[PDB]
Amino acid sequence: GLDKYLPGIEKLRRGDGEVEVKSLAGKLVFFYFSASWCPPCRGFTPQLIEFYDKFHESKNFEVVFCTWDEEEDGFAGYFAKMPWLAVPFAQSEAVQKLSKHFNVESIPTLIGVDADSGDVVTTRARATLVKDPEGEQFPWKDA
């Protein structure tokens, strides 16, 4: 399932270390495309952090930060402010290929996929989360 979006990446960053991609078995995985240079990312990121802290365990999901920053030296500080996972800066080419696959043209963007099947669940979670902070309509499935 995730093999198609993150081919050959067995580990993702978490805090100061790494977690195995296999540890996402069974979860809904959101790819969060954002960057330190993105103005609207400033006000959206804290709304996603509040939703994640409330529901990542009870609604069984994970968030994987996919950076659009191009300065390697700002990655650590920007990701350190997030509580979830990240594709490492060195694997930025995988992030750019994923951005094209999902037709991401602006950021912030939040795409949810089922880890086991790889099926796309929602492509509009940035828009739907701000109108549903309590996740009453989660996982905001695409038609």
Protein topology:
Layout: E1 11-14, E2 17-20, E3 28-34, H1 39-55, E4 61-67, H2 75-80, E5 85-86, H3 92-101, E6 109-114, E7 120-122, H4 125-130
Parallel strand pairs: 3-4, 4-5
Antiparallel strand pairs: 1-2, 1-5, 3-6, 6-7
Describe this structure in a few short sentences.
The PDB classes it as tryparedoxin. It contains four helices and seven strands.
Structure notes:
This protein has 143 residues and is an alpha/beta fold. The protein has 4 helices and 7 strands; from the N terminus they run βββαβαβαββα. The chain has a single domain, classed as Glutaredoxin (3-Layer(aba) Sandwich). It is globular, with a radius of gyration of 14 Å. The PDB classes it as tryparedoxin. The entry lists the keywords tryparedoxin, crithidia fasciculata, trypanosome, anomalous dispersion, oxidative stress, oxidoreductase.
Count all strands and give the number: 7
- Per CATH, the superfamily is Glutaredoxin
Structural class: alpha/beta
Write the element-wise H/E pattern from the N-terminal end onward. Answer: EEEHEHEHEEH
What is the name of the CATH architecture? Answer: 3-Layer(aba) Sandwich
Strand content: 15-25%
Which terms would index this structure?
monomer, 143 residues, alpha/beta, Glutaredoxin, tryparedoxin, crithidia fasciculata, thioredoxin
